[PDB]
Amino acid sequence: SGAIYVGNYRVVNRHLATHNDWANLVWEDSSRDLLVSSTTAQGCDTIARCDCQTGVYYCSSRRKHYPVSFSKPSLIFVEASEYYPARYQSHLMLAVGHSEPGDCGGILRCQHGVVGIVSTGGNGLVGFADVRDLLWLDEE
Ligand SMILES: Cn1nc(C(=O)NCCc2ccc(S(C)(=O)=O)cc2)c2ccccc21
Ligand SMILES: [Zn+2]
Protein backbone atom coordinates (compact mmCIF):
# COMPACT_ATOMS: atom_id res chain seq x y z
CA SER A 1 0.00 0.00 0.00
CA GLY A 2 0.96 3.66 -0.32
CA ALA A 3 0.13 6.91 -2.05
CA ILE A 4 1.59 10.21 -3.28
CA TYR A 5 0.10 13.34 -1.66
CA VAL A 6 0.75 16.33 -3.94
CA GLY A 7 -1.35 19.52 -3.59
CA ASN A 8 -5.00 18.45 -3.17
CA TYR A 9 -4.42 15.13 -5.01
CA ARG A 10 -3.90 11.55 -3.79
CA VAL A 11 -2.18 9.24 -6.32
CA VAL A 12 -2.67 5.50 -5.78
CA ASN A 13 -2.47 2.24 -7.67
CA ARG A 14 -5.75 1.87 -9.58
CA HIS A 15 -6.04 -1.79 -8.42
CA LEU A 16 -5.82 -0.62 -4.73
CA ALA A 17 -8.13 2.44 -4.96
CA THR A 18 -10.86 2.64 -2.28
CA HIS A 19 -14.59 3.47 -2.65
CA ASN A 20 -13.75 6.98 -1.27
CA ASP A 21 -11.13 7.35 -4.05
CA TRP A 22 -13.67 6.40 -6.79
CA ALA A 23 -16.31 8.70 -5.20
CA ASN A 24 -13.90 11.70 -5.37
CA LEU A 25 -12.24 10.74 -8.70
CA VAL A 26 -10.07 13.15 -10.66
CA TRP A 27 -8.53 10.77 -13.26
CA GLU A 28 -7.89 7.05 -13.75
CA ASP A 29 -6.17 4.89 -16.40
CA SER A 30 -6.26 1.07 -16.13
CA SER A 31 -3.49 0.70 -18.74
CA ARG A 32 -1.09 2.58 -16.32
CA ASP A 33 -2.45 1.20 -13.00
CA LEU A 34 -3.02 4.77 -11.77
CA LEU A 35 -5.89 6.55 -10.05
CA VAL A 36 -5.97 10.13 -8.73
CA SER A 37 -8.56 11.34 -6.20
CA SER A 38 -9.17 14.75 -4.57
CA THR A 39 -8.28 15.48 -0.93
CA THR A 40 -9.56 17.93 1.71
CA ALA A 41 -6.07 18.49 3.28
CA GLN A 42 -3.02 19.47 1.13
CA GLY A 43 0.02 17.15 0.86
CA CYS A 44 3.81 17.62 1.10
CA ASP A 45 5.18 15.59 -1.80
CA THR A 46 6.88 17.20 -4.87
CA ILE A 47 6.72 15.38 -8.23
CA ALA A 48 10.04 15.07 -10.13
CA ARG A 49 10.12 16.72 -13.63
CA CYS A 50 13.11 15.01 -15.28
CA ASP A 51 14.50 11.99 -17.16
CA CYS A 52 16.51 10.41 -14.24
CA GLN A 53 17.17 6.68 -14.45
CA THR A 54 18.62 6.31 -10.91
CA GLY A 55 16.77 6.71 -7.61
CA VAL A 56 15.65 5.00 -4.41
CA TYR A 57 12.46 2.98 -3.77
CA TYR A 58 10.70 1.82 -0.63
CA CYS A 59 10.16 -1.96 -0.31
CA SER A 60 7.62 -2.70 2.45
CA SER A 61 8.29 -6.49 2.32
CA ARG A 62 11.86 -5.72 3.47
CA ARG A 63 11.22 -2.52 5.60
CA LYS A 64 14.04 -1.04 3.47
CA HIS A 65 14.74 1.64 0.88
CA TYR A 66 16.97 0.45 -2.00
CA PRO A 67 19.02 2.47 -4.55
CA VAL A 68 18.25 1.32 -8.12
CA SER A 69 18.82 2.01 -11.81
CA PHE A 70 15.55 1.82 -13.80
CA SER A 71 14.41 1.86 -17.44
CA LYS A 72 12.58 4.81 -19.09
CA PRO A 73 8.72 4.57 -19.04
CA SER A 74 7.65 1.96 -21.70
CA LEU A 75 4.74 -0.34 -22.83
CA ILE A 76 5.67 -3.65 -21.19
CA PHE A 77 4.20 -7.14 -21.17
CA VAL A 78 3.60 -8.04 -17.55
CA GLU A 79 3.62 -11.81 -16.87
CA ALA A 80 0.82 -13.57 -14.99
CA SER A 81 1.22 -13.70 -11.25
CA GLU A 82 -0.89 -15.56 -8.62
CA TYR A 83 -3.71 -12.94 -8.46
CA TYR A 84 -3.53 -11.23 -11.88
CA PRO A 85 -3.21 -12.50 -15.43
CA ALA A 86 -0.66 -11.48 -18.08
CA ARG A 87 -1.34 -8.01 -19.57
CA TYR A 88 0.27 -4.97 -21.21
CA GLN A 89 0.98 -1.95 -18.96
CA SER A 90 2.02 1.50 -20.29
CA HIS A 91 4.31 4.17 -18.71
CA LEU A 92 6.03 1.41 -16.73
CA MET A 93 9.72 1.50 -15.58
CA LEU A 94 11.65 -1.65 -14.53
CA ALA A 95 14.53 -2.19 -12.09
CA VAL A 96 16.30 -5.28 -10.69
CA GLY A 97 14.96 -5.61 -7.18
CA HIS A 98 12.68 -7.38 -4.77
CA SER A 99 8.94 -6.84 -4.73
CA GLU A 100 5.73 -8.64 -3.67
CA PRO A 101 2.07 -7.61 -4.35
CA GLY A 102 1.73 -5.66 -1.09
CA ASP A 103 4.75 -3.50 -1.99
CA CYS A 104 2.54 -1.59 -4.49
CA GLY A 105 2.31 2.08 -3.57
CA GLY A 106 5.91 2.37 -2.33
CA ILE A 107 7.56 5.57 -3.64
CA LEU A 108 10.46 5.69 -6.11
CA ARG A 109 12.32 9.06 -5.74
CA CYS A 110 15.24 10.85 -7.40
CA GLN A 111 17.07 14.10 -6.69
CA HIS A 112 14.04 16.02 -8.19
CA GLY A 113 11.26 14.40 -6.13
CA VAL A 114 8.77 11.56 -6.54
CA VAL A 115 9.21 9.62 -9.79
CA GLY A 116 6.50 6.98 -9.44
CA ILE A 117 5.04 4.15 -7.34
CA VAL A 118 5.65 0.39 -7.21
CA SER A 119 3.04 -1.30 -9.45
CA THR A 120 4.30 -4.67 -10.83
CA GLY A 121 6.88 -7.36 -10.02
CA GLY A 122 8.14 -10.88 -10.43
CA ASN A 123 11.14 -12.81 -11.78
CA GLY A 124 13.46 -10.53 -9.68
CA LEU A 125 12.23 -7.28 -11.23
CA VAL A 126 10.18 -4.43 -9.76
CA GLY A 127 8.05 -2.18 -11.95
CA PHE A 128 7.10 1.41 -11.20
CA ALA A 129 4.19 3.41 -12.66
CA ASP A 130 5.66 6.78 -13.77
CA VAL A 131 3.96 10.06 -12.71
CA ARG A 132 6.55 12.57 -14.12
CA ASP A 133 4.48 13.20 -17.30
CA LEU A 134 1.35 14.21 -15.30
CA LEU A 135 2.14 17.94 -15.28
CA TRP A 136 -1.33 18.90 -14.04
CA LEU A 137 -0.57 17.36 -10.60
CA ASP A 138 1.43 20.64 -9.97
CA GLU A 139 -1.54 23.01 -10.33
CA GLU A 140 -5.28 23.49 -9.50
C1 LIG B 1 4.96 -5.37 -6.85
N2 LIG B 1 4.08 -6.34 -7.48
N3 LIG B 1 2.88 -5.93 -8.00
C4 LIG B 1 2.25 -7.05 -8.37
C5 LIG B 1 0.86 -7.00 -8.94
O6 LIG B 1 0.23 -8.04 -9.13
N7 LIG B 1 0.38 -5.80 -9.22
C8 LIG B 1 -0.94 -5.62 -9.81
C9 LIG B 1 -0.84 -5.07 -11.21
C10 LIG B 1 -2.16 -4.57 -11.75
C11 LIG B 1 -2.23 -3.37 -12.44
C12 LIG B 1 -3.42 -2.91 -12.96
C13 LIG B 1 -4.57 -3.67 -12.81
S14 LIG B 1 -6.07 -3.16 -13.58
C15 LIG B 1 -6.21 -1.47 -13.16
O16 LIG B 1 -5.90 -3.26 -15.01
O17 LIG B 1 -7.16 -3.88 -12.98
C18 LIG B 1 -4.52 -4.87 -12.13
C19 LIG B 1 -3.32 -5.31 -11.60
C20 LIG B 1 3.06 -8.20 -8.12
C21 LIG B 1 2.95 -9.57 -8.35
C22 LIG B 1 4.00 -10.40 -8.00
C23 LIG B 1 5.16 -9.88 -7.43
C24 LIG B 1 5.29 -8.52 -7.20
C25 LIG B 1 4.23 -7.69 -7.55
ZN1 LIG C 1 15.14 13.28 -11.39
Q: Where are the domains of the chain?
A: 3-44, 45-140
The H or E element containing residue 24 is: none
Resolution (A): 1.4
Ligand 1 lining (C-beta closer than 6 Å): 14-15, 30, 33, 81, 83-84, 99-101, 103-104, 118-122
Rounded CA gap, 108 and 59, in Å? 10
Technique behind this structure? Answer: X-ray
Rounded CA gap, 56 and 33, in Å? 20
Is 59 a catalytic site residue?
A: no
The secondary structure of 67-103 as a DSSP string is EEE-PPSEEEEEPP-SSS--EEEEEEEEEE----GGG
How many Cα atoms within 13 Å fall on the side-chain side of residue 28? 16
How many Cα atoms within 13 Å fall on the side-chain side of residue 121? 18
Q: How many CB atoms lie within 10 A of CB 125?
A: 18
Q: Whose CA is nearest to atom 19 of ligand 1?
A: 15
Local structure of residue 50 (DSSP, 8 states): S
Is 33 a catalytic site residue?
A: yes
